[PDB]
Amino acid sequence: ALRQPQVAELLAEARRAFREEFGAEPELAVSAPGRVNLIGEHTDYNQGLVLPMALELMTVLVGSPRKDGLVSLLTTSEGADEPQRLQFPLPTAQRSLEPGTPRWANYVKGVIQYYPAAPLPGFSAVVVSSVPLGGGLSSSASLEVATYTFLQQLCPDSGTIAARAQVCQQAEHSFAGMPCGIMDQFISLMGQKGHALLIDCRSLETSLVPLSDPKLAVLITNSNVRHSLASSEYPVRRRQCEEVARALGAASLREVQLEELEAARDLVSKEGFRRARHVVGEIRRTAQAAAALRRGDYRAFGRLMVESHRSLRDDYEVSCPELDQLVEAALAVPGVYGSRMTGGGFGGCTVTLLEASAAPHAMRHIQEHYGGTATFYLSQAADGAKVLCL
Ligand SMILES: O=C1CCCC2=C1C1(CCCCC1)N=C(Nc1nc3ccccc3o1)N2
Ligand SMILES: OC[C@H]1O[C@@H](O)[C@H](O)[C@@H](O)[C@H]1O
């Protein structure tokens, strides 16, 4: 059985908690979703192509401006580290915000710190989410983009959608010590109901690709494991990629194709060569997968998904036995087109494209084959960041 999601239920929860917490009805509501990457993994920081969609799993901030220049936060999200409440003054020229405890508030502090428009007033907010915290569906990008979307109501920015992704990304880098690409923040902002989003991470061109055929489902399976390497080995992959680009005199691996890589094998470590083969291959597969998805060629799409996983398992070596066993189980189920790890790896989630009617059978079979305890979301493509005046 798939874990259910909510929206107005989250707003009502947010709202009740805020009224209890601050003695007044909140003035403002925002939402930003988590994401699944359908294909195009470890390409965003390589100026590659990614094809994410926004989930119905989302973060909701409910708040009001203050006159006293301080920020007061409650989260009801479980899994959030103690305390559930934090207050801090706004940063100034003299005194910047600092990352620390509790860690959940670092995402909000980071976005406030890098917010490009003045004057930013203080505010009171309640934070809720259905995005499982650090389960591999970009809970942190959902919190950053919801925060960003809230600040825009306190003090409108004059900029682009990418500029806002970059701020949220700077918060992730500087306040959470995770040097991510733009994919997660970009999809949280840019998502549309019934669409995946093709992101060119070189040009920052985006295209909404239809994905709401009722005979098709996206099954997210959470391994409910996260090896420490998810955190430590992510920045290592970015450096090895930079090292290969650098060796080949390329601005980025986007500029490099397997032929040029094959010819500069002497110029690069055995592992360097493996990381680049995945990225160069993964960029190709993502363009092929976009072309496939448009035609409604799910069989081809699924094949490209399996190739992405094999590449991530063997060349990028960012899978783990848990994810591999989850992908093995999925590909054994009749009506499954394809399965792969999604996001950073070393745990988190798999994404499976399958005929809707196969989902019940696939969930039973994945669970019985999974040596741990799997969690399931059946995900339609959802809207990106929204605002509701209360
Ligand atoms: O420990 C890690 C390791 C790296 C991945 C990651 C975490 C934690 C950090 C804060 C405490 C819980 C776990 N949280 C997130 N994301 C997040 N999204 C949130 C939305 C609403 C409220 C709180 C939220 O925390 N990501
Ligand atoms: O495709 C791998 C992805 O890993 C995520 O953890 C990261 O936040 C994204 O920016 C992207 O690099």
Short mmCIF file of all heavy atoms in Angstrom, two decimals, residues 35 37 39-46 50 136 138 140-141 169 172-173 178-185 226 230 234 238 278 282 312 316 318 340-345, ligand 2:
data_model
loop_
_atom_site.label_atom_id
_atom_site.label_comp_id
_atom_site.label_asym_id
_atom_site.label_seq_id
_atom_site.Cartn_x
_atom_site.Cartn_y
_atom_site.Cartn_z
N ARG A 35 10.82 16.51 -4.99
CA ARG A 35 10.97 16.12 -6.40
C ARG A 35 11.45 14.68 -6.50
O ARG A 35 12.11 14.19 -5.57
CB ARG A 35 11.95 17.08 -7.08
CG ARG A 35 13.38 16.90 -6.62
CD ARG A 35 14.21 16.02 -7.56
NE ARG A 35 15.54 15.88 -6.99
CZ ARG A 35 15.88 15.00 -6.06
NH1 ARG A 35 15.01 14.13 -5.59
NH2 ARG A 35 17.12 14.99 -5.61
N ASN A 37 13.81 12.75 -9.55
CA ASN A 37 14.49 12.86 -10.87
C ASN A 37 14.14 11.63 -11.73
O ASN A 37 14.53 10.50 -11.34
CB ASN A 37 15.98 13.08 -10.68
CG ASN A 37 16.60 13.60 -11.96
OD1 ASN A 37 15.89 14.05 -12.86
ND2 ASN A 37 17.92 13.54 -12.05
N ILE A 39 15.22 10.90 -14.82
CA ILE A 39 16.55 10.51 -15.37
C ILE A 39 17.42 11.76 -15.43
O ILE A 39 16.85 12.85 -15.52
CB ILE A 39 16.40 9.84 -16.76
CG1 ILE A 39 17.69 9.17 -17.21
CG2 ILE A 39 15.91 10.83 -17.81
CD1 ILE A 39 17.45 8.09 -18.26
N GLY A 40 18.74 11.56 -15.49
CA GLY A 40 19.73 12.64 -15.63
C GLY A 40 20.38 12.92 -14.29
O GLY A 40 20.22 14.02 -13.76
N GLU A 41 21.03 11.91 -13.73
CA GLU A 41 21.63 11.97 -12.38
C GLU A 41 23.13 12.26 -12.46
O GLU A 41 23.84 11.62 -13.29
CB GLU A 41 21.40 10.64 -11.67
CG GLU A 41 21.05 10.82 -10.23
CD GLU A 41 19.64 11.34 -10.11
OE1 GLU A 41 18.74 10.53 -10.32
OE2 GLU A 41 19.46 12.56 -9.88
N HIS A 42 23.59 13.16 -11.59
CA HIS A 42 24.97 13.68 -11.46
C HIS A 42 25.37 14.36 -12.76
O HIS A 42 26.55 14.41 -13.03
CB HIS A 42 25.94 12.62 -10.95
CG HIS A 42 25.68 12.27 -9.52
ND1 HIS A 42 26.28 12.95 -8.48
CD2 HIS A 42 24.90 11.31 -8.97
CE1 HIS A 42 25.89 12.42 -7.34
NE2 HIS A 42 25.06 11.37 -7.61
N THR A 43 24.40 14.99 -13.42
CA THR A 43 24.58 15.86 -14.60
C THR A 43 24.40 17.34 -14.26
O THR A 43 25.06 18.14 -14.96
CB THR A 43 23.66 15.37 -15.72
OG1 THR A 43 22.31 15.45 -15.28
CG2 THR A 43 23.96 13.93 -16.10
N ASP A 44 23.58 17.75 -13.27
CA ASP A 44 23.26 19.21 -13.08
C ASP A 44 24.53 20.03 -12.84
O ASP A 44 24.73 21.00 -13.60
CB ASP A 44 22.14 19.48 -12.06
CG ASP A 44 22.37 19.02 -10.64
OD1 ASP A 44 23.31 18.23 -10.40
OD2 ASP A 44 21.59 19.53 -9.77
N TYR A 45 25.41 19.61 -11.93
CA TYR A 45 26.69 20.32 -11.65
C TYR A 45 27.71 20.09 -12.76
O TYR A 45 28.80 20.69 -12.71
CB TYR A 45 27.23 19.92 -10.27
CG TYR A 45 27.44 18.45 -10.00
CD1 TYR A 45 28.54 17.80 -10.53
CD2 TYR A 45 26.58 17.73 -9.19
CE1 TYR A 45 28.77 16.46 -10.28
CE2 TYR A 45 26.79 16.38 -8.93
CZ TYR A 45 27.90 15.75 -9.48
OH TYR A 45 28.19 14.44 -9.23
N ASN A 46 27.36 19.29 -13.78
CA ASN A 46 28.22 19.09 -14.98
C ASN A 46 27.65 19.88 -16.17
O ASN A 46 28.11 19.64 -17.31
CB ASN A 46 28.38 17.59 -15.27
CG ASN A 46 29.32 16.95 -14.28
OD1 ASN A 46 30.46 17.38 -14.14
ND2 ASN A 46 28.87 15.91 -13.61
N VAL A 50 18.70 17.45 -17.06
CA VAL A 50 18.00 16.67 -16.00
C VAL A 50 16.51 16.65 -16.35
O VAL A 50 16.03 17.56 -17.04
CB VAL A 50 18.26 17.23 -14.59
CG1 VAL A 50 19.71 17.09 -14.21
CG2 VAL A 50 17.80 18.66 -14.41
N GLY A 136 15.65 11.52 0.34
CA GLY A 136 16.17 11.57 -1.04
C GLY A 136 15.24 12.23 -2.05
O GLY A 136 15.55 12.15 -3.29
N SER A 138 14.44 15.69 -1.76
CA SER A 138 14.76 17.14 -1.70
C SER A 138 13.85 17.89 -0.70
O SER A 138 13.26 18.91 -1.06
CB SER A 138 14.67 17.69 -3.09
OG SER A 138 15.52 16.94 -3.97
N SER A 140 14.95 19.49 1.88
CA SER A 140 15.73 20.74 2.09
C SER A 140 15.46 21.75 0.97
O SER A 140 15.23 22.94 1.28
CB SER A 140 17.21 20.45 2.28
OG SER A 140 17.85 20.32 1.04
N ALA A 141 15.43 21.33 -0.30
CA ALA A 141 15.16 22.29 -1.40
C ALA A 141 13.71 22.78 -1.26
O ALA A 141 13.50 23.99 -1.53
CB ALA A 141 15.41 21.70 -2.76
N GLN A 169 20.18 27.51 -3.56
CA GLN A 169 21.38 26.66 -3.75
C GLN A 169 22.52 27.21 -2.87
O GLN A 169 23.22 26.41 -2.25
CB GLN A 169 21.73 26.58 -5.23
CG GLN A 169 22.92 25.68 -5.50
CD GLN A 169 23.43 25.79 -6.92
OE1 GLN A 169 23.31 26.82 -7.57
NE2 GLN A 169 24.04 24.71 -7.39
N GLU A 172 21.95 26.02 0.70
CA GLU A 172 22.37 24.59 0.74
C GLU A 172 23.89 24.52 0.87
O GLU A 172 24.39 23.86 1.80
CB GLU A 172 21.81 23.84 -0.48
CG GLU A 172 22.03 22.35 -0.42
CD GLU A 172 20.96 21.56 0.30
OE1 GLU A 172 19.76 21.70 -0.06
OE2 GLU A 172 21.33 20.73 1.19
N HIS A 173 24.64 25.22 0.02
CA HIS A 173 26.12 25.18 0.07
C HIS A 173 26.63 25.69 1.43
O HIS A 173 27.42 24.98 2.08
CB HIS A 173 26.76 25.97 -1.08
CG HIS A 173 26.71 25.30 -2.41
ND1 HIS A 173 27.83 25.17 -3.20
CD2 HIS A 173 25.68 24.74 -3.09
CE1 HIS A 173 27.51 24.53 -4.32
NE2 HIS A 173 26.20 24.28 -4.29
N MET A 178 26.32 21.23 1.86
CA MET A 178 26.00 20.29 0.75
C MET A 178 26.06 21.06 -0.57
O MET A 178 25.20 21.91 -0.83
CB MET A 178 24.62 19.66 0.96
CG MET A 178 24.22 18.66 -0.12
SD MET A 178 25.40 17.29 -0.39
CE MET A 178 25.68 16.76 1.30
N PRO A 179 27.13 20.87 -1.38
CA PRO A 179 27.36 21.66 -2.58
C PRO A 179 26.64 21.10 -3.82
O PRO A 179 27.30 20.70 -4.77
CB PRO A 179 28.89 21.56 -2.73
CG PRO A 179 29.18 20.14 -2.28
CD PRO A 179 28.22 19.91 -1.13
N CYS A 180 25.32 21.15 -3.76
CA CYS A 180 24.34 20.63 -4.75
C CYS A 180 24.39 21.46 -6.03
O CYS A 180 24.88 22.60 -5.99
CB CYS A 180 22.93 20.69 -4.14
SG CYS A 180 22.35 22.38 -3.75
N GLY A 181 23.87 20.91 -7.13
CA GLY A 181 23.56 21.66 -8.37
C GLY A 181 22.21 22.36 -8.24
O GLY A 181 21.67 22.34 -7.14
N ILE A 182 21.67 22.94 -9.31
CA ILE A 182 20.39 23.71 -9.19
C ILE A 182 19.18 22.79 -9.31
O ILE A 182 18.07 23.33 -9.15
CB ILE A 182 20.22 24.86 -10.20
CG1 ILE A 182 21.08 24.65 -11.43
CG2 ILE A 182 20.42 26.23 -9.57
CD1 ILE A 182 20.53 23.55 -12.31
N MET A 183 19.32 21.51 -9.65
CA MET A 183 18.14 20.73 -10.09
C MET A 183 17.04 20.87 -9.05
O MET A 183 15.93 21.22 -9.44
CB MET A 183 18.41 19.24 -10.30
CG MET A 183 17.11 18.46 -10.51
SD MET A 183 17.36 16.71 -10.93
CE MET A 183 18.61 16.24 -9.75
N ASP A 184 17.34 20.62 -7.78
CA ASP A 184 16.29 20.34 -6.77
C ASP A 184 15.47 21.62 -6.59
O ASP A 184 14.23 21.54 -6.59
CB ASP A 184 16.90 19.82 -5.47
CG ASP A 184 17.57 18.45 -5.61
OD1 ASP A 184 17.46 17.85 -6.71
OD2 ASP A 184 18.18 17.99 -4.60
N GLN A 185 16.17 22.77 -6.53
CA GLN A 185 15.59 24.10 -6.23
C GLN A 185 14.82 24.54 -7.46
O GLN A 185 13.69 25.07 -7.33
CB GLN A 185 16.68 25.10 -5.84
CG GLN A 185 17.31 24.80 -4.49
CD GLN A 185 18.39 23.75 -4.54
OE1 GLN A 185 18.89 23.37 -5.60
NE2 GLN A 185 18.78 23.29 -3.36
N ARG A 226 20.34 5.56 4.57
CA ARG A 226 21.22 6.64 4.07
C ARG A 226 22.60 6.40 4.66
O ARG A 226 22.77 6.60 5.86
CB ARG A 226 20.65 8.02 4.43
CG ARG A 226 21.27 9.16 3.64
CD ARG A 226 20.77 10.52 4.12
NE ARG A 226 21.26 11.63 3.30
CZ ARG A 226 22.45 12.22 3.45
NH1 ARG A 226 23.30 11.81 4.37
NH2 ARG A 226 22.78 13.23 2.66
N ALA A 230 26.56 9.31 1.26
CA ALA A 230 25.61 10.25 0.61
C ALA A 230 26.13 11.68 0.79
O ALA A 230 26.05 12.45 -0.18
CB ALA A 230 24.23 10.12 1.18
N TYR A 234 29.50 12.86 -2.20
CA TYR A 234 28.87 13.82 -3.15
C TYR A 234 29.90 14.86 -3.59
O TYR A 234 30.12 15.01 -4.79
CB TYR A 234 27.61 14.46 -2.56
CG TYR A 234 26.89 15.33 -3.56
CD1 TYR A 234 25.84 14.82 -4.32
CD2 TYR A 234 27.29 16.65 -3.79
CE1 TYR A 234 25.20 15.60 -5.27
CE2 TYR A 234 26.66 17.44 -4.74
CZ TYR A 234 25.61 16.91 -5.49
OH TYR A 234 24.98 17.66 -6.44
N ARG A 238 31.97 15.68 -7.52
CA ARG A 238 32.04 16.99 -8.19
C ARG A 238 33.50 17.33 -8.52
O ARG A 238 33.74 17.85 -9.60
CB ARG A 238 31.40 18.08 -7.32
CG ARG A 238 29.90 17.95 -7.14
CD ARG A 238 29.30 19.30 -6.79
NE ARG A 238 29.71 20.35 -7.70
CZ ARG A 238 29.12 21.54 -7.82
NH1 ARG A 238 28.05 21.83 -7.10
NH2 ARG A 238 29.58 22.42 -8.68
N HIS A 278 29.99 7.98 -17.26
CA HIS A 278 28.59 8.07 -16.77
C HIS A 278 27.97 9.40 -17.13
O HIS A 278 26.88 9.38 -17.69
CB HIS A 278 28.51 7.92 -15.25
CG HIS A 278 27.23 8.47 -14.72
ND1 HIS A 278 26.03 7.82 -14.89
CD2 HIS A 278 26.94 9.63 -14.09
CE1 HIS A 278 25.07 8.54 -14.38
NE2 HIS A 278 25.60 9.64 -13.88
N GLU A 282 25.04 9.83 -19.47
CA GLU A 282 23.78 10.24 -18.79
C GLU A 282 23.16 11.43 -19.49
O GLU A 282 21.93 11.48 -19.56
CB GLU A 282 24.03 10.58 -17.33
CG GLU A 282 22.75 10.69 -16.53
CD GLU A 282 22.03 9.39 -16.23
OE1 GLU A 282 22.38 8.32 -16.84
OE2 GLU A 282 21.10 9.44 -15.41
N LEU A 312 25.14 4.39 -13.01
CA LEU A 312 25.31 4.99 -11.65
C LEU A 312 25.91 3.94 -10.72
O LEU A 312 26.67 4.35 -9.82
CB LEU A 312 23.98 5.54 -11.11
CG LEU A 312 23.54 6.85 -11.75
CD1 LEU A 312 22.04 6.99 -11.67
CD2 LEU A 312 24.22 8.04 -11.10
N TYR A 316 29.66 5.47 -11.97
CA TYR A 316 29.64 6.58 -10.99
C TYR A 316 29.79 6.00 -9.57
O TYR A 316 30.22 6.73 -8.67
CB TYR A 316 28.42 7.48 -11.20
CG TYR A 316 28.74 8.95 -11.09
CD1 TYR A 316 29.62 9.55 -11.98
CD2 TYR A 316 28.19 9.73 -10.09
CE1 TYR A 316 29.93 10.89 -11.89
CE2 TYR A 316 28.47 11.09 -10.00
CZ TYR A 316 29.35 11.67 -10.89
OH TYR A 316 29.64 13.00 -10.81
N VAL A 318 27.70 5.28 -7.16
CA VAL A 318 26.89 5.99 -6.13
C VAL A 318 25.64 5.19 -5.81
O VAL A 318 24.75 5.76 -5.20
CB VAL A 318 26.49 7.41 -6.58
CG1 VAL A 318 27.72 8.28 -6.76
CG2 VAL A 318 25.62 7.39 -7.82
N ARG A 340 15.34 2.77 -11.45
CA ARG A 340 16.68 3.32 -11.17
C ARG A 340 16.66 4.04 -9.82
O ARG A 340 15.60 4.54 -9.41
CB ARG A 340 17.07 4.32 -12.27
CG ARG A 340 16.06 5.44 -12.47
CD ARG A 340 16.41 6.36 -13.62
NE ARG A 340 17.63 7.03 -13.24
CZ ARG A 340 17.74 8.13 -12.51
NH1 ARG A 340 16.69 8.82 -12.11
NH2 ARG A 340 18.94 8.52 -12.16
N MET A 341 17.82 4.16 -9.18
CA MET A 341 18.03 5.12 -8.09
C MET A 341 17.78 6.53 -8.66
O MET A 341 18.00 6.76 -9.89
CB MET A 341 19.45 5.02 -7.52
CG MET A 341 20.53 5.37 -8.55
SD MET A 341 22.08 5.81 -7.74
CE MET A 341 21.67 7.50 -7.30
N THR A 342 17.26 7.40 -7.79
CA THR A 342 17.01 8.83 -8.08
C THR A 342 17.77 9.65 -7.05
O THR A 342 18.12 9.10 -5.98
CB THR A 342 15.50 9.09 -8.15
OG1 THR A 342 15.33 10.37 -8.77
CG2 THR A 342 14.82 9.05 -6.79
N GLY A 343 18.07 10.90 -7.40
CA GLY A 343 18.86 11.83 -6.57
C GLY A 343 20.26 11.33 -6.32
O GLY A 343 20.80 10.64 -7.17
N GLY A 344 20.84 11.70 -5.17
CA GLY A 344 22.29 11.67 -4.90
C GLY A 344 22.83 10.27 -4.83
O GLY A 344 23.96 10.07 -5.31
N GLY A 345 22.07 9.34 -4.27
CA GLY A 345 22.49 7.93 -4.13
C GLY A 345 22.93 7.58 -2.72
O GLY A 345 22.66 8.39 -1.79
O1 LIG B 2 21.71 14.14 -9.72
C1 LIG B 2 22.24 14.02 -8.41
C2 LIG B 2 21.52 15.03 -7.54
O2 LIG B 2 21.92 14.83 -6.20
C3 LIG B 2 21.14 15.62 -5.34
O3 LIG B 2 21.39 15.20 -4.01
C4 LIG B 2 21.60 17.05 -5.55
O4 LIG B 2 20.96 17.92 -4.62
C5 LIG B 2 21.26 17.46 -6.97
O5 LIG B 2 21.78 18.77 -7.20
C6 LIG B 2 21.83 16.46 -7.97
O6 LIG B 2 23.23 16.61 -8.13
#
